[PDB]
Write a protein that binds this ligand. Structure first.
Ligand code: FES
Ligand code: K
Ligand code: MG
Ligand code: MG
Ligand code: MG
Ligand code: MG
Ligand code: MG
Ligand code: MG
Ligand code: MG
Lengths: 137, 86, 49, 135, 97, 100
RNA sequence: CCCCACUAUGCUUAGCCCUAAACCUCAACAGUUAAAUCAACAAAACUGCUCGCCAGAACACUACGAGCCACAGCUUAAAACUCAAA
């Protein structure tokens, strides 16, 4: 069968499997890539936390937290704690356009996890709160 | 918040190629205007400023499309010189 | 220095049909070469610089 | 002595006037010919202006009665697979052959349009013409 | 005067004006299958007329139909309903790889 | 009994053809530049068609060919222009050679 | 100016206040594309008709007077001295 980039829809009968687990059963790696930090939490399909890592928890401080190499290190740390709990395949849900948006995903892979999907959940208000005033620079 | 999850803005990875999956996702969000939208929303653009930029963007697109059409039309005669020497 | 001869007679009529180009000798040469290229179509290094 | 005011009158008027004033001692070689055989319009500079509002060019579209028959024939049967030969001044296309038959049958008193068109196709088929309907 | 002179009339060879794919068809807010053909699969974003090819009138009817269907409980907002992903692709947009 | 211009125009093949879009016409190659064939087909302007890949050597000066016409004159009006820009050539598609 | 916090305020209701680069910096209505196209730039050039408005700069979105739910307010709006420019 040809490859579909559209994820399998829950309730329908798909043939895709990962270690005998369906798409709905794969754990989720939640990456929050902020402008000055990157936070990564791996949770189970039942919303059980399995691992948490951020650039700040990896010994980065101030402007060093807002770097790609800092996020990559945070991903490796979360991957290590998650792999010990039995996680191999993960669904990536990244919210935010920070510098650790892509680098945080690399660390998860270098840490031994297999990414089967990528989901963007960056909050976009549809009309929402007024953002802070522009900066004069 | 109330919608189903892992349908919107979701791309499946093929053969472990996560780089190509991320590029496809980024291309999707770019074409739909979400990337530019998120960036413009970090600081409040004032209504007089938004109208000025929207007017500039709409006029620049028209001018660029009209300049492309002229070059396409006037490139038909880019063929070799038929009357060289005259 | 070699001097170009008169380019018209007493009546004022130029001798060469390309006089009013100002480059009659150059354009007469281009005219002769362009004509030869046409006739060929109708019909069909080391030691020199 | 002369005048290079090409936007003031014409070469004839400017030359004629300077001859009268004695500015030009002799008439140019062309003056006597222009006088005897003048152009239809005196060549006077004019600045082409753009039309605005309710001003429109007087040029009219060229149409003929048979053009209505040609539009229907192309719609019904399309362009003939036979190729136009626009070099032959007496070339007749399948549409022109159709138009001539359609005109002949109209002169025989028939006045209906839908009926005058179906009978014309039959006549050509009898003569051996290929009429493949587009749809 | 002369029989061969041109005659005044309307262009007989004039071609009909173009029509959008939805010209002459009723656009209902309950027809989510139709409405879904004009939103982005990944983001649910309504496509501009330069992508849908619709005219101004049908672009407006489609937009108002989508907005009505979304808030009345017939159509999702943030994504195209996956049931309608295999419908005819009438929009001039290329996404995947 | 001298034929008038209005009569010549009414019965001319170019007038009888109607619109030129999607009309088959016979052209004649009069000038060739590498693989660019200049073809006259009875209109005001010639068309320029690239030598076909198949039987390219059969296309020579004087060879009569079949064309599918698109426009008798390629012209367009561009923004900020009072008149139309013309490339002084017709638009046509070369189909092949005409043979008896 | 840059970073953080927070208030009047932005919102609703009921009253006021009546100001904007309230600007297409294009008064309304009607008509014209022929003249000369037209100082320049803007936004092609004009005609009929009507209302409003203007008459060197600055003083002056000021003083006084008057009216106004306005009371550090708004509208209307000078003069003296000063200059040869603006
Ligand atoms: S073109 Fe007719 S309704 Fe769209
Ligand atoms: K303005
Ligand atoms: Mg507050
Ligand atoms: Mg305003
Ligand atoms: Mg008024
Ligand atoms: Mg004054
Ligand atoms: Mg004020
Ligand atoms: Mg005051
Ligand atoms: Mg007072």
């Amino acid at each position: 069968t040809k490859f579909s980039i559209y994820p399998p829809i829950p309730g329908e009968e798909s043939s895709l499997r990962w270690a005998g687990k369906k798409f709905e059963e794969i754990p989720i790696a939640h990456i929050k890539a902020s402008h000055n930090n990157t936070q990564i939490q791996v949770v189970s399909a039942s919303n059980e936390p399995l691992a948490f890592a951020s650039c700040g928890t990896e010994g980065f401080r101030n402007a060093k937290k807002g770097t790609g190499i800092a996020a990559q290190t945070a991903g490796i740390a979360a991957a290590a704690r998650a792999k010990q709990k039995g996680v191999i395949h993960i669904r990536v849900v990244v919210k935010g356009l920070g510098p650790g948006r892509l680098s945080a995903m690399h660390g998860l892979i270098m840490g031994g996890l297999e990414v089967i999907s990528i989901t963007d959940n960056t909050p976009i208000p549809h009309x929402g709160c007024r953002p802070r005033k522009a900066r004069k620079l | 918040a109330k919608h189903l999850k892992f349908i919107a803005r979701t791309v499946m990875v093929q053969e472990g190629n996560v780089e190509s999956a991320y590029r496809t996702l980024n291309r999707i969000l770019t074409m739909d205007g979400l990337i530019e939208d998120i960036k413009h929303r970090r600081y409040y653009e004032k209504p007089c400023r938004r109208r000025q930029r929207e007017s500039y963007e709409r006029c620049r697109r028209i001018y660029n499309m009209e300049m492309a059409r002229k070059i396409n039309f006037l490139m038909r005669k880019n063929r070799a010189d038929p009357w060289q020497g005259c | 220095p070699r001097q170009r001869a008169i380019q018209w007679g007493e009546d004022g009529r130029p001798f060469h049909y390309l006089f009013y180009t100002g480059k009659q000798s150059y354009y007469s040469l281009m005219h002769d070469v362009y004509g030869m290229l046409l006739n060929l179509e109708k019909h069909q290094v080391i030691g020199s610089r | 002595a002369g005048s290079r005011l090409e936007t003031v009158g014409s070469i004839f008027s400017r030359t004629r006037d300077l001859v009268r004033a004695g500015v030009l001692k002799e008439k140019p070689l062309w003056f006597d010919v222009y006088d005897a055989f003048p152009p239809l319009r005196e060549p006077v500079f004019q600045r082409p202006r753009v039309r605005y509002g309710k001003a429109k060019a007087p040029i009219q579209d060229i149409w003929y009665h048979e053009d209505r028959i040609r539009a229907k024939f192309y719609s019904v049967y399309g362009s003939g697979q036979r190729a136009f030969d626009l070099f032959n001044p007496n070339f007749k296309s399948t549409c022109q052959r159709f138009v001539e038959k359609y005109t002949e049958l109209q002169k025989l008193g028939e006045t209906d349009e839908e009926k005058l068109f179906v009978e014309t196709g039959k006549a050509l088929l009898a003569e051996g013409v290929i009429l493949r309907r587009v749809g | 005067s002369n029989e061969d002179l041109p005659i005044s009339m309307e262009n007989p060879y004039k071609e009909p004006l173009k029509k959008c794919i939805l010209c002459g068809k009723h656009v209902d807010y309950k027809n989510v299958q139709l409405l879904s053909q004009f939103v982005s699969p990944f983001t649910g974003c309504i496509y501009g007329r330069h992508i849908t090819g619709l005219c101004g009138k049908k672009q407006k009817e489609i937009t108002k139909a989508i907005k009505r269907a979304q808030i009345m409980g017939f159509m999702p907002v943030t994504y195209k309903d996956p049931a309608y992903l295999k419908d005819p692709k009438v929009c001039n947009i290329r996404y995947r790889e | 009994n001298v034929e008038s211009f209005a009569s010549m125009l009414r019965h001319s093949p170019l007038t009888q053809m109607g619109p030129a879009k999607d009309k088959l016409v016979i052209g004649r190659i009069f000038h060739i530049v590498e693989n660019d064939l200049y073809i006259d087909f009875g209109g005001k302007f010639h068309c320029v068609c690239r030598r076909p890949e198949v039987d390219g050597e059969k296309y020579q000066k004087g060879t009569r060919v079949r064309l599918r016409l698109l426009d008798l004159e390629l012209t367009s009006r561009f923004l900020g222009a009072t008149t139309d820009t013309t490339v002084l050539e017709a638009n046509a598609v070369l189909l092949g050679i005409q043979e008896s």
